[PDB]
Amino acid sequence: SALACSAHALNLIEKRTLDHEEMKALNREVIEYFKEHVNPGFLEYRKSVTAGGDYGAVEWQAGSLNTLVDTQGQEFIDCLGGFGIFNVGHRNPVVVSAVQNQLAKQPLHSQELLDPLRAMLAKTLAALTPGKLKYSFFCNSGTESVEAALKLAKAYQSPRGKFTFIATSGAFHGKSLGALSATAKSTFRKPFMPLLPGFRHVPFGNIEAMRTALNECKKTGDDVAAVILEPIQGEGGVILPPPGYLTAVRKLCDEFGALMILDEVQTGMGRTGKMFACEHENVQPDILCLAKALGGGVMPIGATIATEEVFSVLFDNPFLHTTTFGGNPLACAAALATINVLLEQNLPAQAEQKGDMLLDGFRQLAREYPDLVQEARGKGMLMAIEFVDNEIGYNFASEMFRQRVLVAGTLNNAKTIRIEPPLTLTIEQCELVIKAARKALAAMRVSVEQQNAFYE
Amino acid sequence: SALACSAHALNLIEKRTLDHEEMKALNREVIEYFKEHVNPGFLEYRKSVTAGGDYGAVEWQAGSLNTLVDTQGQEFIDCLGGFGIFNVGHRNPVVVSAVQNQLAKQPLHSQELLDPLRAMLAKTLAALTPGKLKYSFFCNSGTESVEAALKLAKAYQSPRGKFTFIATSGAFHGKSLGALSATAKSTFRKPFMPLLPGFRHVPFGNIEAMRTALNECKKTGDDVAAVILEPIQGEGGVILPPPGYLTAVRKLCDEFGALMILDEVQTGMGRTGKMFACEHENVQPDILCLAKALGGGVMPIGATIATEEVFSVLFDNPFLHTTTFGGNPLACAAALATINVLLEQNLPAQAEQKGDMLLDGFRQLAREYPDLVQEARGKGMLMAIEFVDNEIGYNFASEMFRQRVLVAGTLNNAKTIRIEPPLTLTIEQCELVIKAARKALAAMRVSVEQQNAFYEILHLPNLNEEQRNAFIQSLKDDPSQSANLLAEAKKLNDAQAPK
Amino acid sequence: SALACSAHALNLIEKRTLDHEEMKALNREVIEYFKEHVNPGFLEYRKSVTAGGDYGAVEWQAGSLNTLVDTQGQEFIDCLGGFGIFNVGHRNPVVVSAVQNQLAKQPLHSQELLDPLRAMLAKTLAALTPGKLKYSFFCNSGTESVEAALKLAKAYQSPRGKFTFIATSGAFHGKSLGALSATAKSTFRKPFMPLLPGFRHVPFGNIEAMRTALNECKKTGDDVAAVILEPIQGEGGVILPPPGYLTAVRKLCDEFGALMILDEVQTGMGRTGKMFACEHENVQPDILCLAKALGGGVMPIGATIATEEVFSVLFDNPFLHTTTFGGNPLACAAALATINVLLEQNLPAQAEQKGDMLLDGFRQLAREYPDLVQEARGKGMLMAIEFVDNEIGYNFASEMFRQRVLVAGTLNNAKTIRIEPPLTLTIEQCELVIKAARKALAAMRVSVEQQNAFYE
Amino acid sequence: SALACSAHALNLIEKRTLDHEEMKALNREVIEYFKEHVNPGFLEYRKSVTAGGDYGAVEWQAGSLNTLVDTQGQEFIDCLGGFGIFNVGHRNPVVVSAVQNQLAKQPLHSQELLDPLRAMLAKTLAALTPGKLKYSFFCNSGTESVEAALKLAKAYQSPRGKFTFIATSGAFHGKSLGALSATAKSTFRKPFMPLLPGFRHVPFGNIEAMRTALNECKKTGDDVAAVILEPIQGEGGVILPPPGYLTAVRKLCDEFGALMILDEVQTGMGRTGKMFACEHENVQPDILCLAKALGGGVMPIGATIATEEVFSVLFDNPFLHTTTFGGNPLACAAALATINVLLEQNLPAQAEQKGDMLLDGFRQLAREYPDLVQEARGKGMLMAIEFVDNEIGYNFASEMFRQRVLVAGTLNNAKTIRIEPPLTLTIEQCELVIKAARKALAAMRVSVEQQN
Numbered sequence A, C: 001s002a003l004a005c006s007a008h009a010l011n012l013i014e015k016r017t018l019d020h021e022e023m024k025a026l027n028r029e030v031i032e033y034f035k036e037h038v039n040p041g042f043l044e045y046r047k048s049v050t051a052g053g054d055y056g057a058v059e060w061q062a063g064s065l066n067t068l069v070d071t072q073g074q075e076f077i078d079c080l081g082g083f084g085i086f087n088v089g090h091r092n093p094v095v096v097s098a099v100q101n102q103l104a105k106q107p108l109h110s111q112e113l114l115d116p117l118r119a120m121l122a123k124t125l126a127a128l129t130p131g132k133l134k135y136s137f138f139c140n141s142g143t144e145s146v147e148a149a150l151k152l153a154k155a156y157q158s159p160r161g162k163f164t165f166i167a168t169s170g171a172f173h174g175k176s177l178g179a180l181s182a183t184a185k186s187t188f189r190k191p192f193m194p195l196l197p198g199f200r201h202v203p204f205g206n207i208e209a210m211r212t213a214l215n216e217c218k219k220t221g222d223d224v225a226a227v228i229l230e231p232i233q234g235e236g237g238v239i240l241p242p243p244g245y246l247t248a249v250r251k252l253c254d255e256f257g258a259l260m261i262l263d264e265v266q267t268g269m270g271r272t273g274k275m276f277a278c279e280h281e282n283v284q285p286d287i288l289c290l291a292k293a294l295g296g297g298v299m300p301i302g303a304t305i306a307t308e309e310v311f312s313v314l315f316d317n318p319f320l321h322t323t324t325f326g327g328n329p330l331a332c333a334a335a336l337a338t339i340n341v342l343l344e345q346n347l348p349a350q351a352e353q354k355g356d357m358l359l360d361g362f363r364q365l366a367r368e369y370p371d372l373v374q375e376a377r378g379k380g381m382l383m384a385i386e387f388v389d390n391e392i393g394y395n396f397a398s399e400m401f402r403q404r405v406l407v408a409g410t411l412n413n414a415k416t417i418r419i420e421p422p423l424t425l426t427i428e429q430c431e432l433v434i435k436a437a438r439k440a441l442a443a444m445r446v447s448v449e450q451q452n453a454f455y456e
Numbered sequence B: 001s002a003l004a005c006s007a008h009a010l011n012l013i014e015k016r017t018l019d020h021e022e023m024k025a026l027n028r029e030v031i032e033y034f035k036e037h038v039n040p041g042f043l044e045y046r047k048s049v050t051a052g053g054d055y056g057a058v059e060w061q062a063g064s065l066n067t068l069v070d071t072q073g074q075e076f077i078d079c080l081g082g083f084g085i086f087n088v089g090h091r092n093p094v095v096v097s098a099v100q101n102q103l104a105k106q107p108l109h110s111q112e113l114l115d116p117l118r119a120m121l122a123k124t125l126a127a128l129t130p131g132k133l134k135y136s137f138f139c140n141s142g143t144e145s146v147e148a149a150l151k152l153a154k155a156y157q158s159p160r161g162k163f164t165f166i167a168t169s170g171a172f173h174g175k176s177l178g179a180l181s182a183t184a185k186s187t188f189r190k191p192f193m194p195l196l197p198g199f200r201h202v203p204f205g206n207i208e209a210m211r212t213a214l215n216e217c218k219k220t221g222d223d224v225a226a227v228i229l230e231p232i233q234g235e236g237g238v239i240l241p242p243p244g245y246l247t248a249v250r251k252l253c254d255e256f257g258a259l260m261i262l263d264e265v266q267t268g269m270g271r272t273g274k275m276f277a278c279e280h281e282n283v284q285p286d287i288l289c290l291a292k293a294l295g296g297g298v299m300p301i302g303a304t305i306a307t308e309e310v311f312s313v314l315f316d317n318p319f320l321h322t323t324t325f326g327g328n329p330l331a332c333a334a335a336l337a338t339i340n341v342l343l344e345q346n347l348p349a350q351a352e353q354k355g356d357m358l359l360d361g362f363r364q365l366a367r368e369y370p371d372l373v374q375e376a377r378g379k380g381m382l383m384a385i386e387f388v389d390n391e392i393g394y395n396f397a398s399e400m401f402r403q404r405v406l407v408a409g410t411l412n413n414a415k416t417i418r419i420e421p422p423l424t425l426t427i428e429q430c431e432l433v434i435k436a437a438r439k440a441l442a443a444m445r446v447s448v449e450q451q452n453a454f455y456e457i458l459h460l461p462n463l464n465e466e467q468r469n470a471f472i473q474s475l476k477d478d479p480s481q482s483a484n485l486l487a488e489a490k491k492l493n494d495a496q497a498p499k
Numbered sequence D: 001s002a003l004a005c006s007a008h009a010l011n012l013i014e015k016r017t018l019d020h021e022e023m024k025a026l027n028r029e030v031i032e033y034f035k036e037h038v039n040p041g042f043l044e045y046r047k048s049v050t051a052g053g054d055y056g057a058v059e060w061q062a063g064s065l066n067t068l069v070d071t072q073g074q075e076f077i078d079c080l081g082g083f084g085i086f087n088v089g090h091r092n093p094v095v096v097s098a099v100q101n102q103l104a105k106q107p108l109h110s111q112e113l114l115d116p117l118r119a120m121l122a123k124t125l126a127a128l129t130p131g132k133l134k135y136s137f138f139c140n141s142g143t144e145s146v147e148a149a150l151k152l153a154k155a156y157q158s159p160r161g162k163f164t165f166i167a168t169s170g171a172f173h174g175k176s177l178g179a180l181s182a183t184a185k186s187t188f189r190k191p192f193m194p195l196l197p198g199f200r201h202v203p204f205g206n207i208e209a210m211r212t213a214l215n216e217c218k219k220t221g222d223d224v225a226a227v228i229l230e231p232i233q234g235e236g237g238v239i240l241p242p243p244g245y246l247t248a249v250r251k252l253c254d255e256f257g258a259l260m261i262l263d264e265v266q267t268g269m270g271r272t273g274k275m276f277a278c279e280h281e282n283v284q285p286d287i288l289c290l291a292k293a294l295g296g297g298v299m300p301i302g303a304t305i306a307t308e309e310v311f312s313v314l315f316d317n318p319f320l321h322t323t324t325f326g327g328n329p330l331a332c333a334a335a336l337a338t339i340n341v342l343l344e345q346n347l348p349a350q351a352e353q354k355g356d357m358l359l360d361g362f363r364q365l366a367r368e369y370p371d372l373v374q375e376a377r378g379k380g381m382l383m384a385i386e387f388v389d390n391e392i393g394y395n396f397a398s399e400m401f402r403q404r405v406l407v408a409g410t411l412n413n414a415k416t417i418r419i420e421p422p423l424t425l426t427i428e429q430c431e432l433v434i435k436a437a438r439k440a441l442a443a444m445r446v447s448v449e450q451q452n
């Protein structure tokens, strides 16, 4: 019964330890329910199962700030970081304390009385963001933040006769249908077509191709409402644009009267060595999207911040764009604590130092193993290792997993492995990660050599 | 500085009490930051400000299961219920305990190791839902659940050559751009057009108009992929369809080979007197959307549940449709606790009993006040009172607010006032809500009767100015006697007619 | 060589007679060139080939006003009438004389000097059309006339925020991509999708379904710019709406602020017993489309006539909507002569009298042959016979062809056979057509009886 | 009454000459009916009215092959050529004779019996066109030919999952809503939006920008069904692409599996010095569009010619794409006669020779008048003179009109004046046109020097 299932799960939530028999029963039950009620594809394509040993690797609790402990007591150093969620580590005490304090008062707002933490977070974000960014709309995810940015741009530009949107190939802006029209990967989009009309893509980091697109749109009467881009493409493989590119896009948008939307869902909250990646060139977009790390690794949250000029489209009818849970007190408490931690501990400067050290180590391994590795790239703690092929990349991800270092990479998506550890990763843990990567590459080379000896 | 602002907010999060001077400083700061950084429109159109007195009504903490306490210590009975979020009350101890226990272990998942609570919640939801609904996709909101439903329908129907979607007028399915294409209100959609192509709308509760839309699409080669609808329209004003309508939509979808998507974001989790409103007629949709109360009034969560036939479009590439935070352990712990509370306390049966009692009371008040009230409607704890006009509805919402009974209604959207209390509302509190509604209606009638008496006594022809001024003076002095004073002035006017 | 091919065709154009050997060589050459350069499907699905005997039936010259003579000297009474083109017969002497006179002066306009016949035809059409219809735009076909109507409606309604168009199922408005968005037949539209957005269809002749569509569009913010419909559906099978329907659509369009577009490409120029079918109920559309018979059966022409209120969208920039050949002197001369013939000879009144007689004859045959015929329908000289099935309808079309009476119907589209003879068809020829139809039905019944007896 | 109006017009059609009083009455009536029933905008923006003197310039008859005579007896040398319709001159006797002969037999087809001239013209066009172009679909105009090309590309490419179309900025492909989606001018498109989805534009003559568009579409899952372009842009101002460009577009279409549609409605039928402009580089498109001069300056006609690979999408249901009047006997007779005239008289070679002579003359005038003329461009008899500004260009068009030489140019669209005379323009007339252009420029310089 649903009653029995819920009671069994509540008992598991209360438990902190599992002996060998309790672990075996739990892991088996979890794998069965993933197969019958979640998605059997997760069992086929995840290294927590393909390289998870006899019982599979099932989550249990956070170990220390930068580690996770599975149901078998295995401790993993976290270099996946939820793809940029865990900037301040796992269960950061300041974030956890803020969420616990707010939970004791009121976790969700009434939807009528003015809610103080929405006002405090909006004020704090206005102080933290560059130039004229002043108003914030709160939501629950990165894709919701991008939907709110596209809607602000539409409400501002439709009365001005502009409806077209330009995005870049390789871009990832979310999977809800509005955000998916800007998202560029063919496999994510094709089954869901037709998407929103008037979305066009140009190569990322190519200013002349962007100018051509905006100019051709102007000549044909399909004037561009907004350009949307990530400062550095995450899902696209940690693709850095040429220096000056973001400043050139800003000038182009000003020239054509298009709004500039910067998607900092992955680069935001200190990851690239500054609070926002737009700060490396001192660029101020018209609309800024945040999510992932803004919730401190404790709550889901998204935020869309804009100038008063753009945001004022929501003033006459404040119910035009809304969300039920967006800006709830628990999420705001987590975000306020995260901003406090990042600034008090100077974690963006730590991301620059640790990211330079890790990227130097990965680049040196790339030089030593050109038979396996193509290139290592990064800015701050947003890094990627590109392998010679998908099979090699998945073998590296699986080997690191067996060495208890968690990295990105699924069975058919592992040619480029993103490395995004918490900004709180210790210097000793940075050294352990490099040592593990070297051991994995050495083991992989031996396996390839032993396969070539058998065939010869 | 951002550091100083965050430290000041963390200090506020740590406080549990506020004296009069701390309340005044906090309320003033909150109003200023809403104006400068949130939306000055909230200050103009919300009754927490227009009927909030000298300092405004600012949130502070939950009082009891069914009440909220503002920064001034004023306690409100909650009949708004976050528009259907607070089904198990405010800070339900079982839900709060589950979230606290999970926070001590791991609040957000790794995105690699298998996460147990996602598997437990998916299993519990399969056991709770009707028929062949078996697989769940977790997300963070109602609009995300509807986006996932539209995407499941698209991935299944595009290889079968079907792309069109039918929704109903009055429908509300969310405000993200995919969901907004199904959402029907013109004011929510027009500034954002063009939306997705191939969305059409038919009147809600009209099966022949739905059949015509499906058939005309078939004839022109624009075959319908899916029909999406709420079992009862919430935002549309608590609109109940005719008996048998949901079963008739199910048969029509089967006949045309269209998928049926039932949006139970507002009706789900016991609100209408059953766990899901589709259980009143025993209808099984192909896809079911949940959110709002699924998070227990503690966490944001959404869920899209489908048959294995439909959901299997995601098996070959389980990364085709994903969400970063969706299905996180805190949200799953809150949902598992909510389902446990609803079943252990049989809150859906309580929603039927309390909803019947409240709706009987509102219907009796509608009979007594046809000058102000057009109709009272509802199913379980999903109710609405429709007033004669917007102004009257906002006066009722403001009067209930002054009596510390929180109801729906904003300055320009108050002709229909939704009443969606927690399913845990006590029988005593149900009686108090009815008494407050009667007091609000009686106060509103006094204001109207006085206004009509002032305009009639000024225009009575056969009365002298000494008499006219004395009646007008008595109306100002005693507004409760407005009906009696008008009858006395009318009798004297007829008696002093030209002989 | 192209030179040799063109010289051979010019020699054929000059020839008026063909002996048996010349006919055999010509028919064989025509069939071969249709297979190799036109479309081999015409040879498979046309009764001029499937019921064309040993040599096929190839066109040669017009016989009398209502007849055609093939390359073998076979004379056919024309009841197909080019689907409503030949209203004033084949080679009507008044139309032919006007075209010959204009050809001796200037057949095509300069595109600079003001062309007199465009001005004369626009004036004549304003006098002929009801109420406030005053301005004409000339083009070359029915589908071009519909494109011009949709463009007039778009230019008027887009500044008023209305973009949606309502058409009816069964409707046929042309096959160019704009007109095809209103055209309703699935097989004509599906390979060409996506078509224009915002086009929606309701059942023809159902006023409540049209009111629902307009009302739902208003509620959702997709307000209807225009409603387009035929007064009687031609391609849809001669579908007559209930009496009062066109007047009710006019009132509904006025109520919602939508424009009314009447497509009279098939019903126009006297075919239904009045000059325009909208005259039966005295309905004035905002825009009226004409083509087919407007060219007198001699020239291609189309015309889109609108009120000054709507047409004035073209006044500030008279080059906004144009055509290269539209309104040329030959086409205008043919149209002016056609209007003169229809009015001088009272051909709309003749269409009413002859149409009532032919439809009475067909309905009596339907009464006698319910084993083959389902129903006969019509208004004036726009008629149709619906058979029990496609096979039976094609057998009737083929039998009439063997009796030298030309009717509509192709191999896989013959359940409903349209009958649209010239309005000049003599009373003696009306009687011959009914006698030929009776002979065809009697022959068809015998064949069915002889087949049912063989299987028993 | 409509009966009285039609009788009055039939009387005018029968008249061959007009005296001074008949001309005055006719011109006044024509201007009034244009104002009240056609479009009053034509009276404001046309040089036949703004530079038409006391009575306006109203058409009456063709003078000789290369001249037009108005209602006042004024004879104009035609360098406008209907923007590329009058390739074989006005009332070419071979074309007129063919149309008259066919009118005596059957002007419009039955829509059932096989019509011989449709088969003869399709055969002649297959012999005339390059490589694998074999099947023809006949229609009535350039915009209809483009609609048929877009539909052939859609029916071939939709089962292959490709729906996007690439056209170039500056392109003109017609004004019906499907063709208008490819047509690039903002003023022609904006009032009619939303047009067909999935249409994009790249700069004309820029192969790398076209490759980027095709590649970005491939990466996002919006694969391109077809590329559509003119070999030389007409309405865009006689814009010649770089050498090798059409061959590079052909290779790029083959690489991405997109169809190549060449719109030769303006360049076709000998105008650029070859029968089709695609013959200069020997490029074979998948679909070729023709119209304008294909009707010999006597009939409206359009043709869409394609390979059997593409056209075969219409074989299973030959009624899928149709047009009532398309391929009618009068139009086919006119086209057969036009092809016969062009080949017998080698008019494409004459267009190359006369075009070189005219463009040399215009380029010499550009060198002498840089104060008024920016540049002269052309290929064969498709030419343009670009002026320093719109006002100067309209002054040139108006001055040439007063010297009885008809050129393109309207009040607000005259910065680039297209010169597209009949290919039959005599060598003497070429010299007279150059002399009139010099006189017009000299008179314009005097008027500017008056202000300065």
Ligand SMILES: Cc1ncc(COP(=O)(O)O)c(C=O)c1O
Binding pocket: A083, A140, A141, A142, A143, A144, A146, A172, A173, A174, A175, A230, A234, A235, A263, A264, A265, A266, A291, A292, B322, B323, B324, B325
């Ligand atoms: C740049 C970017 N935009 C948007 C998103 C979507 O955010 P969410 O998964 O929270 O919907 C992501 C998530 O990976 C992202 O990296």
Ligand SMILES: Cc1ncc(COP(=O)(O)O)c(C=O)c1O
Binding pocket: A322, A323, A324, A325, B083, B140, B141, B142, B143, B144, B146, B172, B173, B174, B175, B230, B234, B235, B263, B264, B265, B266, B291, B292
């Ligand atoms: C029926 C219905 N669907 C969808 C939604 C949207 O949910 P959310 O506000 O969480 O995006 C709501 C919320 O009001 C709803 O009532």
Ligand SMILES: Cc1ncc(COP(=O)(O)O)c(C=O)c1O
Binding pocket: C083, C140, C141, C142, C143, C144, C146, C172, C173, C174, C175, C230, C234, C235, C263, C264, C265, C266, C291, C292, D322, D323, D324, D325
């Ligand atoms: C009602 C109607 N509209 C439009 C058209 C299309 O006209 P055309 O074939 O001349 O393009 C037709 C032709 O059959 C028609 O009957």
Ligand SMILES: Cc1ncc(COP(=O)(O)O)c(C=O)c1O
Binding pocket: C322, C323, C324, C325, D083, D140, D141, D142, D143, D144, D146, D172, D173, D174, D175, D230, D234, D235, D263, D264, D265, D266, D291, D292
């Ligand atoms: C290149 C081109 N394509 C298409 C067209 C449209 O032809 P029509 O005006 O006959 O519709 C033209 C006419 O100017 C043209 O030059």
